[PDB]
Ligand binder design. Structure first.
Ligand SMILES: [Mg+2]
Ligand SMILES: [Zn+2]
Ligand SMILES: [Zn+2]
Ligand SMILES: [Zn+2]
Lengths: 526, 77, 240, 65, 98, 98, 255, 35, 44, 115, 192
RNA sequence: UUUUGGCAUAGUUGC
């Protein structure tokens, strides 16, 4: 342990584990083991002194680094096997301190408990005030949020990308975010939310948004698609070529417009296009010619944002085309808190229709109260309260999980200092009548994230479209078109109903009506 | 002596209304005086309440035999 | 192999006889709407403009279906196809010829789905009779399906982001069948455990619990404004 | 990325104050004092300048093309 | 010349190694892009850390559905050699013998 | 072309040995948010294997304190199998015992 | 059987906002008045936008959206102006529209700020309200931005960019004498700026025969219109709506 | 000399900031590939 | 038609049957010039 | 894509009447005024004004659906009075009140300006 | 329709103030918690001194586990009943639970007073390490927090150890839902 | 003057 803390012969990832009960010492210097730093404790005292922290404060213009703390033997890496042989301290401020001693032999102390959290779970404010299934839900959903995923996205040409117009760093944030770089690349908006029942479009985990706020750019995002295509001279039988085709030169074609393209067989950027248009005029020579041009996915519209032309690995001229499409929040778009409160936009109301406080403040979002009691996302309520306090105080609040100095009592006192109800409940007036709403309403800013799922991305119908080639059933190709699985459970449900003719129509007439002539003496098809 | 129930099952109601509505949609004569109706479904329901549909139900008994029933003979519920 | 083509769910028997893709269907996300009766379902304009029903030409609807044929696919409501008795299919987006649009009894127009039509609303998975139920079409001017707040608990679907399916019947026979067997009012009482399958739900249930308290009192104007929404009201204000 | 033109909730103009907010921060004003100096009382508007990240500075580093 | 090896982005043999953020902006690379992945056919492919049982370590388990009451196994494998990892089991039989 | 193949499709092992060659190592990088990219960079996958059917790994074990996030896993049939590193976690790169 | 006789008392008058009190009036009239404040006080906002050339880092519709939310001083011009869809013109004319032009060519390594100052109207009666000024977009060396826009008459109901008020504070019964709300613990609640309850009570005694009155307003303008102009145009527009409805009802009854 | 309880609450996060300044968040992949 | 070199911004025309290359840089990425068609935006 | 044209949330498209009257058959002297392209702004105020008149036995309004823009106002008066008469008197009272309020507001503006 | 249109006039919410009890209530809850902790210490030292005698048909570990389990159960139930007594008439939690439209009394006892004992497989948290649930505890410990009893409420906030043990508890429910979606309806798919 | 079009294993994601 001395030599590892001095790094003389032993690099500080080699783990040494002494099992006394078996009289064994196992030493592991192989790869694949996982470790974490831990502060070292001796005589029930930290080896980390204030002069070390002073040296850390001047990191720039000093060249004092973490590797000095590793070199001085104050913090050492410990692996899960060696953790078995450790009596660990959670926090030095109470546990190593003299008391009615729970234990009097602490070898190591943790730097901070919050580091047990994950990279996408560390963004949860007050995660220790929520049911842990909600923490898993938020960890899953935060990866699905919309935001500025990378600074150089303008130069990149990815398959699918989403960019939020006006991101905001959360008003309530854990200190770990400062090292996520999520404070510098936020994903979501701090929005005034009022947890209250209303006309009835927020129920069952839905949300009612301010139409006026959306008209001011609230949660407006852009969705970038990118298409790509290469030409080639494969053998001599065929040669695909970028050029706009015509019916007079291509004797096989699809019915659509082709004047958007230029003489190079490509569309100029800045042209507003629908799903049925052509973006790459490209055709193959028959062994006149026939089209194999590239259309847009036939469920959307957009603007061809950027067209790049280059050569592939072989050297054939190939082009990528990034298509922009603005997405305004609409009914059905999915929004989530940092606590698993996922909900679809139930309806949009203008500002005057929405409720409002005595100061004229209207809520950006309204969510059902009944989302709270079963889920028990109390971190959501404390986040709303702390956001209100931070916004009135003009200072970004703290959301470290196990910070003992912060609790709802002190937050309530701070809120009461600013002439508000200490619990955040407010009198609100109905927008349709102006009457005071009888019960008071809890309201305040909360960080919400537009998840990447929109209704136009996932919606389609089927009206006798491009059937299969093997069974003549509807197929999933060129679009979400292709009908829906009329699965065996649906058949069984209709057997329970007894709707035999409806089942016949769905299974036979509406899928693949066919007929065959068969002999009346043998079953052989005529 | 038809041993089966004198009531119309909901499935029989569904089939007879659907078939008579399709018949009316195929320019069949209407055995009741309509009152400005255009939907065949409503006209078929009016005929059923009037008990004036010419269909005869044939209930196949499980032993291969069958019973025949006029719609007006059955109890419409 | 030949055996591999039939075994499992993805074989021909389980994958293409007992269940399959079907034309005349749509699927999308649901959102709450308390202003709809339980038997009514709100649908986007696009799906109804695309999805269609076959109406047989009769001397009663000849004028209405003639006007629908005149409108064509461009506007809503309209039509896609004229199917004469000969079987020829005149597509109503490519033939602006009045010789092709002349109608008579026996023809079948593929008119766009409109309000009051019948649909089967469904959700993966189906676990009981109420997992597929008949609803009445309602055109609403947005891009998601709607549902009354009470028909959620039979379908087990909340408005978190789960989607639901809609199957449009095509013939008048099966349309009457869904009207008289599978509509939501007929499916209120489940035969599973001889009880109602649906009831009153979150905000409505808490609100009625607070409403029927002994000490609730309402002014004249509040009572009159509430009596507006009672569809089955006789029209007589009771004595206070 | 850029500052919004208006507060989403109430609609007061905020696009003529982000640069002034930075300038008053360089005067070592407390952030609450800075927002009070710019006439932002309702916390709807204070949220805007307190929580906005101006990524446009990091985006102009690339070539103009 | 024997072949071409993919290079993890921002690794010690990547061109972006040790450059300043301004130089990355000259190359149109985000300074906050963490790298640590590969570019294959232009697509950004990233490796997921594969968990497996450790090697060279005796482990005593109980195969309840076996003729053995217990089993002491060891996945022995050389360091940087013999990728075939020879797994030995030495097991005490149960007393249900014939 | 071998390494390019094995990163191009996710199959890991010889191309003709794809019958039993374990796959699902190299994946398209999750580029939707910065946090999503980070979470995909640090992801660790446990294969099902023959050992998964003897001991149930889906449950969160106590030894994952401070090394793996207690609540971060895909909600589905992969609960527990796919995990992510704790923030201060660091994985041994290996050194010689000599 | 006739409407009340309202009395007005302007407590505070400023050029960005105004605060007043309406007494002897019904609740519904006050609610409709604030609804008209937000919804149906028309102003002029840049709506139509042609991009002659863009080279900024931000795509075009982002710039158009930003230009939409720029407020414009339309104190008197909005009255004589008319809705474009109502006026008879090819696309635009002074009777129903105002042309704007913008062109900034940054060829300087120092950062450039395309602000509201750079907007150039063809009539001085309408300008950006700031003319510090609103930032529209930052530009680098080598980036141009050239465009021509048109601003037209509209009101907040059609789109929030035509919303003239930056928030309308409303209040009535500050002492909760009517008990329209039920404080579970009235001791915890702050007093309004109009409440006369001293700091030993929390609610006035419950008046049974009371009625809503003494409606307090604080109308905050964005500066597109003066606040007194906003209130006057609000009342004028609501009167116009009711007179039109009376005309249609008379035609209906005569028919 | 030793860190007081009031100062520890910021000293620990200064230590963590120094850690992430030194090593970063993708140390595992980079170090493994270099090795 | 006209294309912009992706490195040195060299505007240059390229035929339909010649591989692309910057006429003063040798760079091998080209971007199409902006469309000269009328584009308009409602500010909503 | 199915987002409605917002400008057709207050404009009568062709073949649409601003207001229509339907005499309800359940109760005598009961009428239903269906007004298109309107909202709570006129409905609430007209409801209150009709409630002011003692001769109006019952007065109320509803919106059948918020996305649509019909408003249906039910009015029932005594059997010596037309509901249309009550509606017209209510509109005249509101217009007179708002004109009086405009005059008094201009006077108050002038007073605060001089003061 | 009528109930929603009235609810506009009435209105319904849920707030932080709805999750606050009296200081006397918190004091009584803490007294009960310290009582339960001391009782569990008494049972632990009795078992240590070989003074706990096993019940018939049960080993000593089973007897000790059942005793401490029921001690924590009745302590949790007493704290929950005390929390239920402290609720007001305007408490929106009580509005939503009495109506039965969402939540339950157990949920109110969890949010306000005591989250309660976590469980895996129907037992307390096992010794993943040798004779230890986590490194922060001493070897051969059977106290409530050492074996995974959460003592704080959600509003009070979980400790790191209690937070991790509750994450372990919820992982069991997520596994249950996963194997549900695996095996649900295969029974039905054969039955039909 | 009428449009078509692939199968596959693997991966991720959503109730
Ligand atoms: Mg769901
Ligand atoms: Zn604001
Ligand atoms: Zn004109
Ligand atoms: Zn060049």
């Amino acid at each position: 342990r001395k030599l590892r803390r001095q790094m003389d012969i032993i690099v500080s990832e080699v783990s040494m584990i002494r099992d006394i009960r078996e009289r064994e010492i196992r030493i592991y210097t192989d790869a694949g083991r996982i470790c974490r730093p831990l502060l070292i404790v001796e005589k029930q005292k930290l080896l980390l002194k204030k002069r070390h922290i002073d040296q850390l404060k001047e990191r720039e213009y000093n060249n004092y680094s973490w590797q000095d703390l590793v070199a001085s033997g104050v913090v050492e890496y410990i692996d899960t096997l060696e953790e078995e042989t450790v009596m660990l301290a959670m926090t030095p401020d109470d546990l190593q301190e003299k008391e009615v001693a729970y234990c009097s032999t602490y070898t190591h102390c943790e730097i901070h408990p919050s580091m047990i959290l994950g990279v996408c779970a560390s963004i949860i404010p007050f995660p220790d005030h929520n049911q842990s299934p909600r923490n898993t839900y938020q960890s899953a959903m935060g990866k699905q949020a919309m935001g500025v995923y990378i600074t150089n996205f303008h130069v990149r040409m990815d398959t699918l990308a989403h960019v939020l117009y006006y991101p905001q760093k959360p008003l309530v944030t854990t200190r770990s975010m400062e090292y996520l770089r999520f404070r510098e690349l936020p994903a979501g908006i701090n929005s005034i939310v009022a947890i209250a029942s209303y006309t009835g479009y927020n129920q069952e985990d839905s949300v009612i948004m301010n139409r006026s706020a959306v008209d001011r750019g609230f949660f407006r995002s852009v969705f970038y698609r990118s298409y790509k295509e290469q030409e080639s001279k494969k053998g001599f039988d065929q040669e695909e070529v970028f050029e706009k085709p015509t019916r007079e030169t291509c004797q096989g074609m699809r019915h659509a417009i082709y004047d958007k393209l230029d003489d190079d067989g490509l569309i100029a950027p800045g042209v507003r296009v629908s799903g049925d248009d052509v973006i790459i005029g490209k055709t193959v020579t028959l062994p006149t010619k026939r089209d194999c041009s590239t259309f847009l996915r036939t469920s959307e519209t957009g603007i061809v944002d950027q067209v790049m032309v280059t050569l592939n690995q072989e050297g054939y001229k190939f082009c990528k085309i990034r298509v922009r499409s603005v997405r305004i929040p609409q009914i059905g778009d999915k929004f989530a808190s940092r606590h698993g409160q996922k909900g679809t936009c139930g309806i949009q109301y203008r500002q005057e229709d929405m409720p409002f406080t005595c100061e004229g403040i209207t809520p950006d979002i309204i969510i059902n109260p009944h989302a709270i009691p079963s889920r028990m996302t109390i971190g959501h309520l404390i986040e709303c309260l702390q956001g209100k306090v931070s916004a009135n105080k003009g200072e970004i609040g703290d959301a470290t999980p196990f910070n003992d100095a912060v609790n709802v009592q002190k937050i309530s006192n701070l809120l009461s200092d600013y002439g508000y109800h200490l619990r955040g409940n407010e009198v609100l007036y109905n927008g349709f009548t102006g009457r005071k709403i009888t019960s008071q309403i809890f309201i305040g800013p909360t960080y919400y994230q537009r998840l990447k799922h929109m209704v136009d991305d996932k919606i389609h119908s089927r009206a006798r479209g491009p059937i299969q080639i093997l069974n003549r059933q509807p197929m999933e190709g060129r679009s979400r078109d292709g009908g829906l699985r009329f699965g065996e459970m649906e058949r069984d449900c209709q057997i329970a109903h007894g709707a035999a003719q409806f089942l016949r129509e769905r299974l036979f007439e509406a899928s693949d009506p066919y007929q065959v002539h068969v002999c009346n003496l043998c079953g052989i098809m005529a | 002596k038809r041993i089966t129930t004198p009531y119309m099952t909901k499935y029989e109601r569904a089939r007879v209304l659907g078939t008579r509505a399709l018949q009316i949609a195929m320019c069949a004569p209407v055995m009741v005086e309509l009152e400005g109706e255009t939907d065949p479904l409503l006209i078929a329901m009016k005929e059923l309440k009037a008990r004036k549909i010419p269909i005869i139900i044939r209930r196949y008994l499980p032993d291969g035999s069958y019973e025949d029933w006029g719609v007006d003979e059955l109890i419409i519920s | 192999s030949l055996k591999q083509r039939l075994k499992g769910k993805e074989g021909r028997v389980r994958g293409n006889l007992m269940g399959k893709r079907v034309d005349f269907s749509a699927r999308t996300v649901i959102t709450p709407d308390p202003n709809l009766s339980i038997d009514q379902v709100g649908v986007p304009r696009s799906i109804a403009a695309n999805m269609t029903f076959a109406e047989i030409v009769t001397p009663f609807n000849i004028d209405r279906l003639q006007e629908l044929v005149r409108r064509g696919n461009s506007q809503y409501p309209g039509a896609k196809y004229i199917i004469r008795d000969n079987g020829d299919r005149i597509d109503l987006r490519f033939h602006p010829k009045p010789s092709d649009l002349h109608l008579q009894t026996g023809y079948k127009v593929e008119r766009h789905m409109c309000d009051g039509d019948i649909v089967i609303f469904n959700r993966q998975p189906t676990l009981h009779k109420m997992s597929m139920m008949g609803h009445r079409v309602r055109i609403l001017p947005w891009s998601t399906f709607r549902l009354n707040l009470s028909v959620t608990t039979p379908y087990n679907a909340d408005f978190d982001g789960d989607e639901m399916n809609l199957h449009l019947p095509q013939s008048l026979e099966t349309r009457a069948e869904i009207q008289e067997l599978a509509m939501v009012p007929r499916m209120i009482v489940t035969p599973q455990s001889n009880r109602p399958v649906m009831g009153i739900v979150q905000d409505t249930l808490t609100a009625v619990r607070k409403f029927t308290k002994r000490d609730v009192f309402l002014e004249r104007g509040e009572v009159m404004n509430l009596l507006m929404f009672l569809s089955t009201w006789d029209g007589k204000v009771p004595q206070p | 990325m850029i500052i919004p033109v208006r507060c989403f909730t109430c609609g007061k103009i905020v696009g003529n104050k982000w640069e002034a907010y930075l300038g008053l921060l360089q005067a070592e004003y407390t952030e609450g004092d800075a927002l009070d100096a710019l006439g932002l009382k309702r916390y709807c508007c204070r949220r805007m300048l307190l929580a906005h990240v101006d990524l446009i500075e990091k985006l102009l580093n690339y070539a103009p093309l | 010349f024997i072949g071409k090896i993919p290079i993890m982005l921002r690794s010690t043999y990547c061109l972006l190694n040790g450059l300043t953020d301004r130089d990355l902006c000259e190359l149109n690379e985000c300074p906050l892009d963490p790298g640590g992945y590969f570019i294959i056919n232009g697509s950004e492919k990233v490796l997921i850390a594969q968990e497996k049982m450790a090697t060279n370590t005796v482990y005593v388990f109980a195969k309840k559905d076996s003729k053995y009451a217990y089993t002491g196994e060891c996945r022995s494998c050389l360091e940087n050699s013999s990728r075939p990892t020879s797994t030995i089991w030495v097991s005490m039989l149960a007393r249900g013998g014939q | 072309d071998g390494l390019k193949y094995s990163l191009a499709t996710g199959n890991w092992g010889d191309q003709k040995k794809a019958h039993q060659a374990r796959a699902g190592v190299s994946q398209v990088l999750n580029r939707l948010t910065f946090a999503s990219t980070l979470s995909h960079l640090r992801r660790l996958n446990s294969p099902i294997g023959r050992d998964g059917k003897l001991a149930k790994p889906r449950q969160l074990h106590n030894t994952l304190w401070g090394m793996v996030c207690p609540a971060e896993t895909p909600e589905g049939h992969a609960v527990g199998l796919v995990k992510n590193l704790a923030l201060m976690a660091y994985i041994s790169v290996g050194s010689q015992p000599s | 059987p006739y409407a009340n006789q309202p009395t007005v008392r302007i407590t505070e008058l400023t050029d960005e906002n105004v605060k007043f009190i309406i007494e002897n009036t019904d609740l519904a009239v006050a609610n409709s008045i604030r609804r008209v404040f937000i919804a149906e006080v028309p102003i002029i906002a840049i709506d139509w936008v042609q991009i002659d050339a863009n080279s900024s880092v931000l795509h075009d519709e982002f710039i158009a959206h930003r230009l939409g939310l720029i407020p414009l001083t339309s104190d008197d011009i909005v009255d004589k102006l008319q809705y474009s869809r109502d006026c008879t013109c090819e696309e635009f004319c002074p009777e129903c529209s105002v042309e704007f032009t913008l062109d900034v060519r940054c060829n300087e390594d120092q950062t450039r700020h395309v602000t509201s100052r750079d907007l150039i109207s063809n009539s001085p009666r309408v300008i950006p309200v700031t003319s510090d000024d609103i930032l529209i977009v930052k530009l680098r060396k080598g980036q141009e931005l050239r465009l021509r826009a048109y601003a037209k008459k509209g009101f907040g109901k059609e789109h929030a960019k035509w919303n003239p008020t930056a928030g309308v504070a409303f209040e009535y019964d500050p002492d909760n004498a009517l008990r329209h709300t039920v404080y579970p613990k009235p001791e915890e609640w702050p007093k309004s700026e109009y409440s006369e309850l001293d700091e030993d009570e929390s609610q006035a005694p419950y008046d049974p025969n009371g009625k809503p009155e003494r409606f307090y307003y604080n109308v905050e303008s964005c500066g597109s219109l003066r606040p007194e102009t906003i209130v006057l145009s609000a009342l004028s527009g609501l009167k116009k709506k009711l007179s039109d409805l009376q005309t249609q009802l008379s035609h209906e009854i005569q028919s | 000399d030793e860190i007081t309880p009031d100062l520890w609450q910021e000293a620990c996060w200064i230590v963590i900031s120094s850690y992430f300044d030194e090593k970063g968040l993708v140390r595992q992949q980079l170090d493994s590939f270099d090795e | 038609m006209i294309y912009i070199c992706g490195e040195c911004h060299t505007e240059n025309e390229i035929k339909s049957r010649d591989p692309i290359r910057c006429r003063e840089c040798g760079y091998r990425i080209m971007y199409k010039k902006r469309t000269k068609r009328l584009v308009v935006f409602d500010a909503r | 894509m199915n987002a409605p044209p917002a400008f057709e949330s207050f404009l009568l498209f062709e073949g649409e009447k601003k207001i229509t009257i339907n005499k309800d058959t359940k109760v005598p002297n009961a009428c239903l005024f269906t007004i298109n392209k309107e909202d709570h702004t006129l409905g609430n105020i007209i409801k209150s004004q009709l409630l002011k008149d003692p001769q109006v036995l019952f007065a109320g309004y509803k919106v059948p659906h918020p996305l649509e823009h019909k408003i249906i106002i039910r009015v029932q008066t005594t059997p010596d009075y037309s509901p249309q008469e009550a509606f017209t008197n209510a509109i005249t009272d509101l217009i007179s009140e708002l004109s009086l309020l405009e005059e008094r507001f201009r006077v108050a503006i002038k007073d605060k300006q001089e003061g | 329709t009528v109930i929603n249109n009235w609810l506009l006039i009435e209105g319904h919410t849920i707030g932080i103030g709805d999750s606050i009890a009296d200081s006397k209530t918190y004091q009584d809850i803490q007294n009960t918690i310290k009582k339960a902790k001391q009782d569990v210490i008494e049972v632990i030292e009795k078992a240590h001194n070989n003074e706990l005698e096993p019940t018939p048909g049960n080993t000593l570990r089973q007897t000790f586990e059942n005793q401490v389990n029921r001690i924590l159960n009745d302590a949790r139930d007493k704290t929950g009943s005390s929390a239920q007594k402290s609720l007001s008439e305007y408490n929106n939690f009580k509005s939503m639970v009495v109506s039965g439209a969402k939540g339950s009394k157990i949920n109110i006892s969890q949010v306000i007073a005591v989250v309660g004992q976590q469980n895996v497989e129907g037992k307390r948290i096992p010794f993943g390490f040798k004779h230890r649930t986590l490194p922060h505890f001493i070897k051969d410990d059977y106290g409530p927090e050492s074996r995974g009893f959460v003592e704080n409420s959600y509003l009070a906030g979980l400790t790191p150890t209690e937070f991790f043990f509750h994450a372990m508890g919820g992982r069991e429910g997520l596994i249950d839902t996963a194997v549900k979606t695996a095996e649900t309806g295969y029974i039905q798919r054969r039955l039909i």
